[PDB]
Amino acid sequence: KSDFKFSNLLGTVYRQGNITFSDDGKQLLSPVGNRVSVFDLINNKSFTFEYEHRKNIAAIDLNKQGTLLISIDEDGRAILVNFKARNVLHHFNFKEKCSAVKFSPDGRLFALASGRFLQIWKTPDVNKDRQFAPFVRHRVHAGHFQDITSLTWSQDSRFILTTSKDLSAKIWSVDSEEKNLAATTFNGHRDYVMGAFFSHDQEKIYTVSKDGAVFVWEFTKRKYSWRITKKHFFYANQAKVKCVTFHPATRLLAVGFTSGEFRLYDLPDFTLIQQLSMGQNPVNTVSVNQTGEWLAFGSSKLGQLLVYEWQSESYILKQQGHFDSTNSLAYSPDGSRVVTASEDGKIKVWDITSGFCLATFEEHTSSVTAVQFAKRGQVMFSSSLDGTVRAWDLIRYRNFRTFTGTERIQFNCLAVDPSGEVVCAGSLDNFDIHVWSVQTGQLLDALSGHEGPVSCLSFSQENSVLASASWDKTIRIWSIFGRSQQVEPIEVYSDVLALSMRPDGKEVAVSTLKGQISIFNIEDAKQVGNIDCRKDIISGRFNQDRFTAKNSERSKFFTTIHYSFDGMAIVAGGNNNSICLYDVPNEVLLKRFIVSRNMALNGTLEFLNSKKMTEAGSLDLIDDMRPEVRVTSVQFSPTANAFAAASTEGLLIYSTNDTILFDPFDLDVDVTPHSTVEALREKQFLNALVMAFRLNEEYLINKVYEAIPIKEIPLVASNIPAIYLPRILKFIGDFAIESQHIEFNLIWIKALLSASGGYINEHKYLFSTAMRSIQRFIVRVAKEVVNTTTDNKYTYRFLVSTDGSM
């Protein structure tokens, strides 16, 4: 109900590290932040791992059994994780900045390259239990003079070939009893050698410099030892090589440069196959699937990645994100796709089922401040600092209207009538609320009454009164329509940020600047109550500030709140690293999440390390600025218990999985999952259904729901009592959205809201998030299936009933 585990991180599809496919070409592991995302390609899904690193991660690898991965950040704090259970296994501190880690093809030894030493360790087991010190060191080799840059194995786990910013590149045998087989050292490049590869048989050794040279070492004669046979070249002029990989069996080299270009070759012939670019910023990491069909290219600075199928040139997914510019958020009114408005001025449109974008909108010049959706799903409005509130259709995926002021003032918040007929925007420097008709783009009016900038706006979703909140310490209620234009002011203690009104349209939550959040019934002007939200938001002391985190007052308040969709719980987020959620009847905190636990962001820690302080200046203001942590806008989803929060590392999305919980409902001694399964096998289906709901174990709900047969679903759907309808309606929604038994689900929905439609009709707000997931399910799988089956019907009818032979 309120146990939001960290579900996904939308946005920022790659930032820093090395992309890695799984063994089977199904999942792509991307080093997103201090966490690791996993993109499942075929089952078009994704998740992010719940564990976090203390800085940005810089090395990923999982063994070829796909069972456990390790991930290493900037100071070597390696963390390994059961990949099939998504939990942490062991933390470790390699003492210096690692560069690349590689499990063996055997997967029993992994070696990594910390600084100039390489070190082979042997792995722990998923099957052997969680030991205290699981890492047993195999050996450590020190044959280099500068930092290692890359690392590879043989196809068997016998030799390991390393290459460094020292001009040489060397080879090693993993046991102490193959020292004569490989001990030598390959000099000869001009610049940083960063590629060193065995061939498919281990006899050819391809080495790749930084300035585009490729040598082919081969153990041939003038006993005789590793003669370079050929110096092939690249000849990209100002593009030194940035990242190399080489699939051995299909014999495919892939090189990304500084110029934002990549080329893939068939190497033993040295034939250029593909040469093409992704942008003006370098390809930071190539990696390649084991079956050679797919490649993956990550460019860090624009934050983009691209998996490319090179046999048939068809892009599996190409994506681009942001960083620390995620300025606002919206959901589609069916909770299926998300809109991210970002401060460079662009409107990304993500979706929740996958993790990918599907449409940017690169239209605005300066920043986009706030967005929200309107008019039955498929209009969304975006409001900028260009002086523009512009509409967007989300079916043709185009602009269609652009309202401006009369003088180019920057806009800061907007709202829109739910009956999508008027659009209201508020600024920092005009003290007014601009109202535009939207069916005709002309400026309707400008309505005033404040004397400070209007911080936030909203429209009531039912009675269409508008609620604005401004730094006059004042909230103001306008009734616009219907011959009146009647204003009503309400004073509050400090100045206001972050209005958000309840889905009933009966009251308003405001987030004042003193760390408090008030609630006002709007039929009166009466305050219902307020939550002192100040002493429970941990505000991190920065790196450069000379006051404590306690006496600091940078973020001891909130800047965006939102209700839940039953009108019962306010989620709130600010310029601090805490996003809290409260429940308004009891007026109490019920959970506080921290958004990030890495010191790469600025305001995370409230207690900084003392050893970094010097005689003058801290040791992190010495350059060789740092981005703050903020949560700019937070929303609950319409169709889940899940909620999203747009922070500097993109959208965090937390969610409920009621799978892992015991969250029962007035059970007693007799009712037992064994008792429900015996009640089902003696077939009293209504009793077994409520006997499963009282357990509230969703796999019992799944089992009883599937084992009820079709010929009495009207009977049990009639006899089901009133207090279980929200549970069964939302269960049918969130199971049917990814299920398969479509006719079964639709029989169940037809039975349910035929037998008990009126109760929903007089309890609309009880089922507002319930039967929105059902309508999402309807219009986003079943209507499409009906569309194609009707297209088949009509194309058959035409291709039979018409004739012609010429």
Added chain:
Amino acid sequence: AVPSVQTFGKKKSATAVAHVKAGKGLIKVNGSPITLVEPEILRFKVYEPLLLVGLDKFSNIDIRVRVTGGGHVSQVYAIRQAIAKGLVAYHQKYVDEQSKNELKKAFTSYDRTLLIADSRRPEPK
């Protein structure tokens, strides 16, 4: 030295200052006792901050209230606003902040004009 707190309270032009400190439980308006406050029919309008929440919260503090300006009803609204937010500020600073927002909940559930005056008027229709 001694723990004190000074708050204000304003109706139309009357202004009330309240010095609340730790004491023995005496409530004085210009030296007069709180019982001897005219116009004698809004003595309960003066009483309701110390009557809504019980005198046990007033047992340890003593309040002295100066008033200037305004007529009779403006002075009694200024007195009750000053008494109320002086008690709230004393409990915000020196004792339980939980008791602070208990008192704030009580006063706001009764009427918030006993905590925040409604200043910015009129309207040009």
Added chain:
Amino acid sequence: DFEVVEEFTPVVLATPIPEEVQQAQTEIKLFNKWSFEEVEVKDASLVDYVQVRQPIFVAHTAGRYANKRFRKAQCPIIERLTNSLMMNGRNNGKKLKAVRIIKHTLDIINVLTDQNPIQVVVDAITNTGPREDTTRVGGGGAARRQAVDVSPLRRVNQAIALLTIGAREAAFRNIKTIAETLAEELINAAKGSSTSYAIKKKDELERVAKSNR
């Protein structure tokens, strides 16, 4: 059985408060004499249009109940009555005098008929509010009317106006003051005894509505 001990030293403060006041701190009564609970609007259709669920001390709340439309149907009925009672050209503004004379009024209402005067005045309102009237429609400028029904806000407002101006007109040139005149008018209206001005005008208006129905 069970107890809850909140206070641990009795109320002995330095300015010695009156005992009836520190007895009124347990529960709010109007004028420290009349408890607002066990007072019900006996009628339906005026419940949540005569505010009695929110107790007050005196009838001089200084809230704002004229800026919005229906929010004058939420300030409590006693000071609704005294604000209508202040209305005449001789005595505008004098709502402290209005408060004290309705204090004397409902005090003698209790000492005559002792249930509680707030219940007396609430069911006086419910019995005095007219349930139909007419409207002087044009009809070619003839003697033309048509019966309509009355919304409960207009019912409550017209009941309060009828009671107050009936008390004034019956206390114009008599020995009785406006206090006891309003008292006897409210008692007759509470019984519905067809004697007082407001119940007479109510039955007359419903009579002409039924006639021109």
Added chain:
Amino acid sequence: YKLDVLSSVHFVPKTPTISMEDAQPLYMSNASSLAPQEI
């Protein structure tokens, strides 16, 4: 960019065949996204 990065509180970050155009609009595999009035 340089004047409004120093006038702000929060941090601001700043031939072959194709640059691949990774930031594409209009894409739910749409070809005729024009309105019938616009045709």
Added chain:
Amino acid sequence: KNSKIFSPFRIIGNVSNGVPFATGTLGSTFYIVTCVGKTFQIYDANTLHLLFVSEKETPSSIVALSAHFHYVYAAYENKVGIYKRGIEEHLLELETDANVEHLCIFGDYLCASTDDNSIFIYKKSDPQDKYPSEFYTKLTVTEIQGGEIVSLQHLATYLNKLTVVTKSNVLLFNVRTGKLVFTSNEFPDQITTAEPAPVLDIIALGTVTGEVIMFNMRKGKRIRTIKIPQSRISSLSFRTDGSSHLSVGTSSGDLIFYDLDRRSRIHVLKNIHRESYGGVTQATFLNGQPIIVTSGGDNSLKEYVFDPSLSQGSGDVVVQPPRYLRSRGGHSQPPSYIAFADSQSHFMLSASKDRSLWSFSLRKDAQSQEMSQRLHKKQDGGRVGGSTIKSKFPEIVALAIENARIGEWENIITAHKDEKFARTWDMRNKRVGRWTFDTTDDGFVKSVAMSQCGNFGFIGSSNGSITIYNMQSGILRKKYKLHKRAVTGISLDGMNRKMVSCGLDGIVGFYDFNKSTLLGKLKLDAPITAMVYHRSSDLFALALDDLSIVVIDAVTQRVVRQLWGHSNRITAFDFSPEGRWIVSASLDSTIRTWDLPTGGCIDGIIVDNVATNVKFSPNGDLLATTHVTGNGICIWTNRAQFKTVSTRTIDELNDIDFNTYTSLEQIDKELLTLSIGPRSKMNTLLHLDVIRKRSKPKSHFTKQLREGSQSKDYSSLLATLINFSPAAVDLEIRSLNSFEPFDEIVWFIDALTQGLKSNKNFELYETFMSLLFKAHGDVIHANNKNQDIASALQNWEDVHKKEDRLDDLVKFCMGVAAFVTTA
């Protein structure tokens, strides 16, 4: 017993036990190998962090350990384990049943000695490998030759000799020929310590009377004697940085530093380690270092540094007294009560029978530090009561954490043994809080709890009253008086709506806040000794005295579960943080797990010592148990988080066992069923031409098709066809080789007919038909009324007609859903 849910992990918070440690050098570093009961531990000596532990325990307890350069030689019941980096590298089984007592390492010959004066010495097979692996010989000291053994060592510059130190005599050996060489003189009392000197060939040896003899073994004499009154000596050492300093350690907790150049006491140290736990078990100088590493039996290791002298001219005569330097300790008695501080499972709190409170850190084991008993001064004028001498607090019984307002005011509450009040603490700045919450009815504190909003504290006295307090002033708020004997458990909800009291009378009282009435009373038929509220799921589990664990949900006040099956008093519970399990440990030396949905007992570990306290971590990964004995605190890792476990009532279908449930393929053939997997296969198949046209930069199947054609069923063809990639599906289906007969087209349309006859994957069969229609429907429209393809299309539509109930259903459901969500 072995388990199946929890695996034991480590006994944290434990430093030493009383076995004499050893030290080893590596370059210019120093490591201290100390024993903790059964496993050992390797600290370093510079920053005194932990470095290593044994990877798995020993069979018996370790009796004696030593250390060469990389290797640690542990010694228990019959064996000696040669270890490297805390991993065992070689066992050495001794050729006896006698229990080993001491050992030494020198050159090649390892030498261990049992408890009957029998000395097994071992030898390295190659004078180049790393550790002595091969049995060389067995010397045996007889009672003619001396007393029973007390130490042995090879002091320096001796060609393959050895020195056995008995209780009455010193006796050398030549270990190559197995020969005795020099028995010493007679000694008139029992000696108990002998450590060599860094000067040539002498050994200092201290007796049970407080004298140190300095035997010169080359001379065979004694050189000097340090006399000390009635001190049971325990541990000698020498300082080797040039300035000669002997250091004796007396088992009365004394450490005396003698000069030797002028026979003077430099400085005494009194009560350095506790007397009763053994005193100074082992104290040594690090060689070439002016520091001292002491270790007692009282779970404490200390370092004492000698400062440079202040007399720059005199120098060695004026010696500054030893400072105190880094030290690592735990509490020295078994811990009474145990809590987890934060949700991150980083800090945990112990309070022990020796009346100390510690904050252990189970992340990094140098962060563990004692909380401090220094009272905040009364700033109203009062004087601190108690005593004048600063004794430690009385024994801690119960305590309660709520990290919600941490460090902003007082944080945690505690409840001491048989004292009338209950002081509070702070966890962020780690000392005693300002206030002492009092019971106001003379009953001792038995239950403490606090709200998860961190304001209200809750004292439950032995006379039944429950006084609630505020924790940012320390004043009282209200006194709930319902019970008539000792209240044993208090809790309050998450959202502070209802609170639950739990007495020894069997009364469980459901009160609510904000209206101080009660609203429920329950009577159980036993006295109640514990209550654990699961604040997430509103259940709370109670001990009883008929050994039940009664789980009551707080909303409808039902007794919702009753876990039977224990044999003695249940000392502890904890909810799993999901609320699925109750882990409960009880005085029949057992610790059982209850799956509270099924009400069953999943597994019961038979633990050797009775676990007093059992606590799950805020996150479900660690189970910390504390026992009757052992100075540490044993933390347990649940394997249930990494693999799913059974649910099966033990006593000394698989889907409902393993709590999971797979979804069946279709309910019956009468129902439609979409494809298993992605729902974007439909859109990618319908649009993959324009998908690749927008994403461009600026046969086996026919074999199976005629196979299934001649066998007249296409199920194997459809099983092939469904599950491969959209690109390959379209590239295959685009070319279907149909010029005159169109047999292949009729086979394909009949294949889709047989496919959507089954009512399964019918979205995929619809889009395959639509893919064929866009592919080469032109030839179907061209030679339409070809008899074969017209028959295939006719019975294809005759089976397609059954799929109109789907659009009837969804166009019902969408319209009525829109109507009930708008109007």
Added chain:
RNA sequence: CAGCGAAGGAUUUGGUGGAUUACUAGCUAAUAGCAAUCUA
């Protein structure tokens, strides 16, 4: 003034030691030697 109150009470401030990130030992020319030395 009062009371609190076990052989003192209450403050100012320096230094050292332990934390402030998650505990796999040091050095070097590193499949080994060193830790008393890498020299012949």
